[PDB]
Scaffold this active site. Structure first.
Site, PDB file in Angstrom:
ATOM      1  N   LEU A  27       0.378  -0.998   0.123  1.00 37.58           N
ATOM      2  CA  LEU A  27      -0.044  -0.260   0.222  1.00 37.58           C
ATOM      3  C   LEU A  27       0.882   1.018   0.147  1.00 37.58           C
ATOM      4  CD1 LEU A  27      -2.560  -0.926   3.129  1.00 37.58           C
ATOM      5  CD2 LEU A  27      -3.301  -0.795   0.102  1.00 37.58           C
ATOM      6  N   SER A  28       0.152   2.499  -0.355  1.00 37.92           N
ATOM      7  CA  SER A  28       0.859   4.356   0.062  1.00 37.92           C
ATOM      8  C   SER A  28       0.930   4.053   1.293  1.00 37.92           C
ATOM      9  CB  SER A  28      -0.323   4.858  -0.669  1.00 37.92           C
ATOM     10  OG  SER A  28       0.367   5.940  -0.732  1.00 37.92           O
ATOM     11  N   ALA A  29       2.559   4.291   1.458  1.00 38.23           N
ATOM     12  CA  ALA A  29       2.477   4.558   2.911  1.00 38.23           C
ATOM     13  C   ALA A  29       3.215   2.999   3.738  1.00 38.23           C
ATOM     14  CB  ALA A  29       1.677   5.273   3.755  1.00 38.23           C
ATOM     15  N   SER A  30       3.216   2.718   2.731  1.00 39.95           N
ATOM     16  CA  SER A  30       3.707   1.103   3.971  1.00 39.95           C
ATOM     17  C   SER A  30       5.408   1.052   4.033  1.00 39.95           C
ATOM     18  CB  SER A  30       3.251  -0.043   3.136  1.00 39.95           C
ATOM     19  OG  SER A  30       4.157   0.224   1.670  1.00 39.95           O
ATOM     20  N   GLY A  31       5.376   1.658   3.234  1.00 39.40           N
ATOM     21  CA  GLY A  31       7.087   2.100   3.516  1.00 39.40           C
ATOM     22  C   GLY A  31       8.231   1.501   2.382  1.00 39.40           C
ATOM     23  N   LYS A  32       7.770   0.851   1.378  1.00 35.10           N
ATOM     24  CA  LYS A  32       8.174   0.741   0.644  1.00 35.10           C
ATOM     25  C   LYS A  32       9.395   1.313  -0.577  1.00 35.10           C
ATOM     26  CE  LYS A  32       4.516   1.156  -2.978  1.00 35.10           C
ATOM     27  NZ  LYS A  32       4.167   1.522  -1.957  1.00 35.10           N
ATOM     28  N   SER A  33       9.795   2.374  -0.257  1.00 32.52           N
ATOM     29  CA  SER A  33      10.251   3.610  -0.592  1.00 32.52           C
ATOM     30  C   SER A  33      11.534   4.075   0.154  1.00 32.52           C
ATOM     31  CB  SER A  33       9.530   5.152  -1.610  1.00 32.52           C
ATOM     32  OG  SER A  33      10.746   5.891  -1.853  1.00 32.52           O
ATOM     33  N   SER A 101       2.319  -0.925  -7.404  1.00 28.99           N
ATOM     34  CA  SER A 101       2.011  -2.611  -7.605  1.00 28.99           C
ATOM     35  C   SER A 101       0.710  -3.253  -7.061  1.00 28.99           C
ATOM     36  CB  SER A 101       2.605  -3.454  -8.263  1.00 28.99           C
ATOM     37  OG  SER A 101       3.820  -4.065  -6.762  1.00 28.99           O
TER      38      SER A 101
END
Ligand SMILES: Nc1ncnc2c1ncn2[C@@H]1O[C@H](COP(=O)(O)OP(=O)(O)O)[C@@H](O)[C@H]1O
Ligand SMILES: Nc1ncnc2c1ncn2[C@@H]1O[C@H](COP(=O)(O)OP(=O)(O)O)[C@@H](O)[C@H]1O
Ligand SMILES: Nc1ncnc2c1ncn2[C@@H]1O[C@H](COP(=O)(O)OS(=O)(=O)O)[C@@H](O)[C@H]1O
Lengths: 203, 200
Positions: A27-33, A101
């Site tokens: 999810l957005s803000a899950s911390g991927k980046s 994704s």
């Protein structure tokens, strides 16, 4: 002079590392980046290897600056990113991608492209799907850019987790429950996995 | 106790012990671009010990650009995408080596500005042979097919090739050993200090 291009084997030994792709999804803000940036730092700095992140910043306004939000464009976005990660993996670099994704087919398409043999070898390149998992409530409490708020107000149409679904991976190579877990520990969970597969040089 | 900011070029350069850049080969079909690319890649990776990668028809035409046919909107797109991929490689501190005819000055110029617009070096290499030389090599019979109209808009026969006016390296790639040609390119790279020190 050499008439035949470097083989994976010669390149692997000459570059002293393997090539593979680490694909973050969540999810957005899950911390991927956040995990991708730190993971890259450790690989290049601590591990002494060639690793490179692919994400919105260097893809959206470059290679894929011509893609919009149509179904077709969204699929093409994923297709292109995957082919590019594969090129880096073929060059014996470790590609790190951090795109939401949201759909299982998004990752399946990326995995398939990697899992198919390369021109010359009998095997493809490793594709490490990392599920950066946080409950939507956690993502909403973070919401650094205010996207969730604007998502719950149509300002943003169909937003993953709010007005569009996120299809969670059932069997990712690495499942990181990235909440109530320090970033350094999450990145370590990833590097530790890579070492169990011997995807990394000594140390 | 972690990095909030992504690696900088300066830091990646220190850590990787090399600069990133793009070596763009341009020239007619059968001018010898892939041959030069392959040997160049061998030398850079093996003898100079750096990370370099060839972007050729092989890994591109059947993958990233498999959806591209031949309309001019497509040949422009083919070049554009290749240029963006080359840039990512250079940005990663790799030496990208592209070998596509890239017949139009406009496309190569667009590729170049994508890099120079601090910025990445773009070494345009003109792999030059007069068309009669390429046509006598014709290793895949493509010229014969172009002459017969079996292949339309064939560069140098039924379509134009706009030679680079001022390329960084001009290789008169005829009656010339491949080793001598590659050396010309590598020597130019050293005059610019693009490569780490030669191995002792
Ligand atoms: N393990 C973590 N613990 C606490 N906060 C985190 C953790 N990982 C990421 N974050 C924070 O969550 C927010 C979203 O991270 P971000 O990397 O932008 O996510 P994404 O790339 O998935 O959209 C940021 O404020 C980030 O610092
Ligand atoms: N310096 C050279 N002298 C003579 N023949 C060459 C030279 N370099 C390449 N060739 C030959 O020319 C043909 C075309 O070379 P190739 O590299 O595939 O061209 P291009 O990639 O530009 O289409 C090959 O059969 C190759 O062996
Ligand atoms: N109409 C055509 N013009 C030039 N090359 C062609 C054509 N049709 C097929 N080819 C083949 O495709 C190669 C040229 O492809 P590229 O290098 O990718 O060209 S570029 O113009 O788009 O840079 C040639 O070596 C030839 O095998």
């Amino acid at each position: 002079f050499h008439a035949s291009a470097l083989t994976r084997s010669e390149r692997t030994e000459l570059r002293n590392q393997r090539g593979l792709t680490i694909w973050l999804t969540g999810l957005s803000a899950s911390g991927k980046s956040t995990l991708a940036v730190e993971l890259e730092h450790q690989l290049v700095r601590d591990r002494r290897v060639h690793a490179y992140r692919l994400d919105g910043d260097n893809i959206r306004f470059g290679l894929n600056k011509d893609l919009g939000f149509s179904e077709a464009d969204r699929n093409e976005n994923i297709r292109r990113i995957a082919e590019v990660a594969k090129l880096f993996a073929d060059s014996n670099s470790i590609a790190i991608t951090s795109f939401i994704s949201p759909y299982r087919k998004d990752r399946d398409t990326a995995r398939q492209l990697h899992e198919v043999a390369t021109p010359g070898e009998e095997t493809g390149l490793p594709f490490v799907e990392v599920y950066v998992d946080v409950p939507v409530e956690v993502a909403e409490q973070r919401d650094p850019k205010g996207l969730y708020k604007k998502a719950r107000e149509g300002v943003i149409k169909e937003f993953t987790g709010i007005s569009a679904p996120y299809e969670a991976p059932a069997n990712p190579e690495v499942h990181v429950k990235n909440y109530e877990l320090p970033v350094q520990d999450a990145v370590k969970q990833i590097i530790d996995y890579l070492d169990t597969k011997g995807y990394l040089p000594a140390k």
